[PDB]
Amino acid sequence: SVDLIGINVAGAEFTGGKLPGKHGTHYFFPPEGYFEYWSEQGIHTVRFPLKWERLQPSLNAELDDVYASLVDDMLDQAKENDIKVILDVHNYARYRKKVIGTEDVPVSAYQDLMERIAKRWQGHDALFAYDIMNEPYGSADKLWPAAAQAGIDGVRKYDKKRPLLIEGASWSSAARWPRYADELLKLKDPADNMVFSAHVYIDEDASGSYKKGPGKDFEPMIGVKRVEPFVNWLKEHGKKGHIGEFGIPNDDERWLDAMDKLLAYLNENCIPINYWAAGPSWGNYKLSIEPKDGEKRPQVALLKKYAAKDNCSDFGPAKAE
Ligand SMILES: OC[C@H]1O[C@@H](O[C@H]2[C@H](O)[C@@H](O)[C@H](O)O[C@@H]2CO)[C@H](O)[C@@H](O)[C@@H]1O
């Protein structure tokens, strides 16, 4: 089943400056009882960021025992708690700051990573899908479509069933999607289970930093307006979609109204969303929906209303008929 409502659970990718880094100091996996809270809230799909450099300290070599085992543990806990997990290689189309497709990081090395990820986890019941790369951007954009095919090829050697979530150029911007996405039309998935995943924030620069409030001229449909270019492209090209990140601060009711409008539009078009973000070690982060003393998380109540609505049969938008 494809859940329309889901959340990111971030932390395993934190403190990119420290490699390998230390669990519990630089990065954080869900502790005991973590998924039970979210399951009880009625959330059954999670997107989980992972750091490539921690999974694979050397290219074209075996996955790191300790970090990969933490992923094993997380998947086990998700399964215990009725949660389905999208593994996200949260790397901006780069390995140790070098773009996939450059001499340092050949596409074959990225294919190798994806082979190893699918080989290790394809047998895990909690695994739902693979988001093969978070937010290609900048000098990675031009080479990304070639890298994406290599990633698809890698997963499909070992997992011929699960959805592949394919992000786009320019931080997978939903708003700018059609400017660049035609380059993705050459991608092929022999299993026919490929889904494009765009990101949308509704601050002025769409970075999610929220440097300003809604403003005097706030438009409630801002979220919808920013995903329309993506969804319309999907319809035009007969493709399937997904929103892998969207988040808002908890300090202005207007953001919630925009979120509501967005959720309605995505629901209508059978496009699932992963809210950014929950996680075990966010502290005061403005977009966090993790429970924290003294903080209300109105975004959660809203997600819960939607979570009750029927899911679609598959990733939308529905084919024309
Ligand atoms: O969208 C999340 C992503 O935003 C990045 O900032 C971009 C922004 O997306 C884009 O619309 C604007 O034109 O450019 C900025 C960069 O200057 C941000 O850098 C990422 O960390 C973030 O994940």
Side-chain angles (χ1 to χ4, degrees), residues 2-21 23-102 104-160 162-187 189-215 218-321:
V2 184
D3 289 330
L4 287 175
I5 300 300
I7 64 181
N8 283 269
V9 171
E13 84 287 12
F14 285 6
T15 318
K18 298 293 178 182
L19 300 172
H23 186 220
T25 299
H26 307 115
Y27 65 87
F28 308 87
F29 279 76
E32 296 163 81
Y34 181 89
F35 285 129
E36 181 169 39
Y37 166 81
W38 287 111
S39 183
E40 187 189 352
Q41 291 302 306
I43 300 306
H44 296 282
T45 291
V46 161
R47 176 174 183 257
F48 196 89
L50 296 176
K51 196 87 170 70
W52 183 358
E53 293 85 354
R54 291 187 179 128
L55 275 178
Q56 224 179 13
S58 181
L59 295 177
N60 294 321
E62 184 64 85
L63 304 185
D64 183 70
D65 181 36
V66 171
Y67 193 81
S69 290
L70 292 173
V71 179
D72 296 344
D73 299 342
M74 179 278 294
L75 287 168
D76 293 346
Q77 193 193 147
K79 183 180 174 183
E80 297 172 353
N81 290 280
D82 203 20
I83 288 174
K84 297 185 293 294
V85 180
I86 300 167
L87 293 180
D88 152 28
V89 181
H90 203 85
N91 264 71
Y92 309 93
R94 291 159 170 90
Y95 179 87
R96 299 182 186 275
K97 300 192 184 309
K98 299 296 191 283
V99 169
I100 299 164
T102 58
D104 290 333
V105 187
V107 297
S108 56
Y110 178 51
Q111 179 162 346
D112 176 271
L113 170 70
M114 299 314 302
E115 287 178 354
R116 296 178 192 277
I117 292 176
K119 178 178 175 176
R120 189 172 181 127
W121 292 301
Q122 65 81 29
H124 206 299
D125 292 338
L127 182 66
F128 175 70
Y130 309 83
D131 186 341
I132 70 169
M133 185 58 57
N134 185 65
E135 294 185 4
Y137 76 86
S139 67
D141 283 350
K142 190 172 179 176
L143 289 167
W144 169 240
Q149 188 65 64
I152 291 165
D153 293 350
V155 173
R156 288 295 183 231
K157 174 166 179 173
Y158 293 95
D159 188 334
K160 295 184 175 54
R162 289 184 178 84
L164 298 172
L165 273 52
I166 311 300
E167 296 185 44
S170 195
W171 301 274
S172 212
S173 166
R176 296 184 293 280
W177 190 265
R179 293 197 199 164
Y180 321 118
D182 285 5
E183 294 288 358
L184 302 177
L185 293 173
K186 55 174 169 292
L187 297 181
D189 176 10
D192 187 32
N193 211 2
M194 194 176 85
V195 180
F196 295 98
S197 185
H199 293 183
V200 53
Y201 293 92
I202 57 175
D203 55 342
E204 186 180 338
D205 72 353
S207 70
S209 59
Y210 289 91
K211 289 174 170 170
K212 288 295 175 59
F218 177 68
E219 165 61 66
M221 291 292 274
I222 185 173
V224 174
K225 301 298 193 188
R226 284 187 178 176
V227 296
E228 278 176 340
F230 174 57
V231 174
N232 288 335
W233 182 94
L234 298 170
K235 294 177 176 173
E236 179 179 339
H237 295 284
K239 303 298 188 184
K240 294 170 281 194
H242 180 269
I243 299 292
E245 297 186 12
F246 164 88
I248 49 163
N250 73 353
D251 67 356
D252 198 311
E253 292 179 338
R254 288 171 295 179
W255 295 129
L256 288 162
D257 181 46
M259 176 173 170
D260 188 22
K261 264 65 175 174
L262 175 59
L263 291 172
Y265 177 77
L266 297 180
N267 170 282
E268 181 166 288
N269 287 282
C270 290
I271 305 293
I273 192 173
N274 298 150
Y275 183 95
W276 182 275
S281 190
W282 268 125
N284 63 293
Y285 177 54
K286 69 170 68 178
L287 307 188
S288 176
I289 48 165
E290 196 70 28
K292 181 172 185 286
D293 297 329
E295 298 296 327
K296 289 178 179 184
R297 306 302 198 198
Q299 309 94 319
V300 178
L302 185 51
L303 289 171
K304 291 169 67 177
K305 294 198 298 183
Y306 283 89
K309 301 185 181 292
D310 283 4
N311 288 326
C312 302
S313 64
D314 214 324
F315 295 89
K319 288 173 161 285
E321 62 176 56

